[PDB]
Amino acid sequence: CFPITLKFVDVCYRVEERTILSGVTGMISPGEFMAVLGPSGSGKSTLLNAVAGRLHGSNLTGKILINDGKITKQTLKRTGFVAQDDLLYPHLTVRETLVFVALLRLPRSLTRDVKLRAAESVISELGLTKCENTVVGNTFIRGISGGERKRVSIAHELLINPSLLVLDQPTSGLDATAALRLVQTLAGLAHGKGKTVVTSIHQPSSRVFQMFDTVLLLSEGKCLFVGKGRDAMAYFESVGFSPAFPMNPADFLLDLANVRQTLVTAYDTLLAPQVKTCIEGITTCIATWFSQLCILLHRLLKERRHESFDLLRIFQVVAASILCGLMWWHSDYRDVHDRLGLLFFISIFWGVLPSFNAVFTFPQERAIFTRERASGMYTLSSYFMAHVLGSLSMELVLPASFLTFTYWMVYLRPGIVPFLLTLSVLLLYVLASQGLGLALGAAIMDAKKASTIVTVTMLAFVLTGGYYVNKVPSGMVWMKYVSTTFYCYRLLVAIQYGSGEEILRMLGAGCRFVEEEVIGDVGMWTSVGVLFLMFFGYRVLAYLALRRIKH
Amino acid sequence: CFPITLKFVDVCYRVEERTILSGVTGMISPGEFMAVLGPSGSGKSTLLNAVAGRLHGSNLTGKILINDGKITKQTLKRTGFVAQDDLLYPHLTVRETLVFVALLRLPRSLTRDVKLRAAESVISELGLTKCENTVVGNTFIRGISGGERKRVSIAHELLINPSLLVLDQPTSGLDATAALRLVQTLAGLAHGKGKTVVTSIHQPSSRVFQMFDTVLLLSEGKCLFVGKGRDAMAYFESVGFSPAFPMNPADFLLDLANVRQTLVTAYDTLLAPQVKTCIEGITTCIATWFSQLCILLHRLLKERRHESFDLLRIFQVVAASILCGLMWWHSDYRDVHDRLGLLFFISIFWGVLPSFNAVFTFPQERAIFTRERASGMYTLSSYFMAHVLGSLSMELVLPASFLTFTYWMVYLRPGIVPFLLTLSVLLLYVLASQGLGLALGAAIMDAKKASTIVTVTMLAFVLTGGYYVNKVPSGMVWMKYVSTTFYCYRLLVAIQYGSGEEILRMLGAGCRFVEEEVIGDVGMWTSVGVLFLMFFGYRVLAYLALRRIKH
């Protein structure tokens, strides 16, 4: 195994400017059980958060050390953290969640059956058998109780067996017997494997307290006692405070922490020097990536079973296509002005809808993305590829259904080849718009601040598309080459009306209008290549934005 | 005070089809303390919700009675329910939240100072003085700890002094001293005022257990013991179960609840018949409404001061206006085709933006709206008026800033009268679009499907705006009068270019074009009246949708 020793010296926290912690010092060796006790608001989820490395900035003072070294990402890979909040996927069951975690983080030198057995044994040990076939749920949908979600979160980190384990009040919400059994399991995990377990209990009983190895006492940002658990009562008796009647020691510790100045001075004069002196190949990556991508795809699809399946989308897009076809019923080839508006409207529709839809993806899952990123479940590239692969399963269906009706109701230029070319061009444009929407949604954390920005950006793209204005100023004409709607409209008009040499045949001012609204100054291959470039670049920018966010 | 006798008889709950509760009978008299004890997953919280009237449907059997009568809304007005989850406004402080509650619910016959004193005394009693000047926060922003949020939620209902008080594990997350103080406060509130208090503790100490009047024991959906707390040990000693060593009685109760069949049979044979036999002016409303509206407005603006105060919105709207003005730089009055498109684009912009920005208002606050509505803090009409009044403070600024630049960069028809008329028309149109967006967002409380539905509806409105198609089918002409963009565009063109008599001096095919795209078949007054009608109707439909949702 990998031993870990943990040290924190003169750690103080200042944010008004109030002090949350000050003058806390201590260590925990491997194979030692650490408790962080204190009254409510004394500071118990901030020391552990800083211990786990989840806190940064200039508000942190003192020195924190792991193996006489600074906190590193490789060290953080072996750290398990169980916080108070239960950030769980609502549409999965307990079995699926724990099996996914076990497949993801267990070593890749064992068969599937061994990992499944490990997950099942972990489920059975924690007493989760009864509700192992139920939806986890969340605050909105009806799922499991609050006492089982804590055990699920416990098993989320216990499945991997991290060398360093930090728990943030894991016994809150369970009865005496269940909490005692969980504490006994933690004690067996700490003593029987030489690991480093730090926990912050709040309401411990005498039986639970008796098996605790070391206890730290915090009183509103000040340390009061540290060392062996059995010596707390003796030390406080020697300092001048004695129980009037026999009672549980932890209650006395909390009462003393809840007079305070004398205890602080006595501790600072007695235990300060003793504590201050005692302290001094390549194919494997490919295989793992593909397996992880498969697992992520399965999880994403399982989540999307009850969300992505929406008959309303098809029943509305079909109605919109029928309305569009009826409005342009059998318009002939002669009126080029009437049929040029239909292509621009199609471009507006399929540049507005996917871009607006794609902005809701990353911010929706932001709540659990940080939680899964902090532990180090998988590299962000696998998640990005999983998302882009999952989206395309449903996204591409709508434009096909739209065109299948619109192209034949309006009776555009007959031919299978123009049909296929137009469909491919429209799908590429939709992909580019979705990529732009995803990038803009990833750039800004909130899902609603980015909504207005996306709306204004795509409306500016529509304005620059070239259909509205004709007398563009000479010095402000370059913006036409940036908008994604321009290339799609040019490709559609070039496909439908060729190069314009045919149009002048029937027509024999009109020639200038046809020349300016048909030929243009951009080629087909250039338009396709630039569309592909935009589709690559938007995903690249979204990946960079996702890389930027790290706590 | 108003006494309440609470009864539940043969309450069973069945949802796979797995039973959560079955054979639960009992009663609590005024001035009596009720406990719901049991292991994790025993269904105590479901029973607590059922007794509080928060559960409906055919899944509930048995009979529930209050004062020998069914649960009514007037009775629900006297009930204070606190659950495990803490639904609090993240951008408010403790003082502001509790003061708002005290002003909203305390009787309208006392001075402001008395209510403020009640709030301050409640704050001081619960030990919240130290952090009473901090932001409450949520999972995203840094606020108060999890141990103080529970006390805030407890005070949220303690400020009212309801006759019936139901608590769902209120002591989870606090130390021994804080838990003891809260339990003593609850005991004094129950015995000293003749109230009806039902709670479900999970990890009680002997001292806490000794002051509990009555205790009910649940074992995975089955009752095990009910009656006085002091007789809990004697009954199980008589039935044939005795602890080997002296220990806390609640631990023994949980162990027995955690063998089970014999206890169930003994309880069904012994204590069943005994319990079964024991079971058997006008101006005031106006004055209050305006004050409630004032408080709601203050809370809304306090919340929006940290979110709606975005300079990006103006910095982007002014940029879009500058781009629009540069695109149409000093276009003369001769080209009607180049100038009608600008008005249509303005209509598209100011229909798309507010409608899409008004779809997330209600779903965002849905999380707390149900919690506030269940208690009965205020009528829905006050909340609706508060929301519509708060929105207009910020919404109306954007169109004015847009027009101030666009109308004079393009140099439209000079004159203060056309400027004011078109500004009023644009403001009415943006209000109507915002109303439509609000109604659609209220109809479906999800922010995912509503966005797509609103986008498709607005795109259909744009298509039916009348700028794209010219050969409309005879049987496809009525829905022109349904879209709001049609009225907005007609008003804009009528204001800018008059009745068309003016255009024909220069006009002299073109005459038909001017007649069809200038005069139309709808009047100015009709357009304004129909716009006002739509503005009223959308808010009416939104109010109906908000009224519909009741758990």
Ligand SMILES: Nc1ncnc2c1ncn2[C@@H]1O[C@H](COP(=O)(O)OP(=O)(O)OP(=O)(O)O)[C@@H](O)[C@H]1O
């Ligand atoms: N719709 C459902 N279908 C199936 N099982 C359900 C359903 N809703 C709840 N359950 C299960 O029924 C049991 C009832 O739990 P409940 O929500 O009443 O919490 P509780 O008993 O108060 O527990 P705790 O003390 O651990 O918070 C749980 O095991 C829960 O997972």
Ligand SMILES: Nc1ncnc2c1ncn2[C@@H]1O[C@H](COP(=O)(O)OP(=O)(O)OP(=O)(O)O)[C@@H](O)[C@H]1O
């Ligand atoms: N940014 C901040 N500014 C001011 N005060 C803060 C800030 N963040 C936290 N606090 C306060 O500092 C104190 C430290 O609380 P902390 O987050 O450590 O919880 P805790 O002691 O583990 O709580 P509990 O044991 O009651 O669950 C709390 O009173 C909290 O409200």
Ligand SMILES: [Mg+2]
């Ligand atoms: Mg904490």
Ligand SMILES: [Mg+2]
């Ligand atoms: Mg519960």
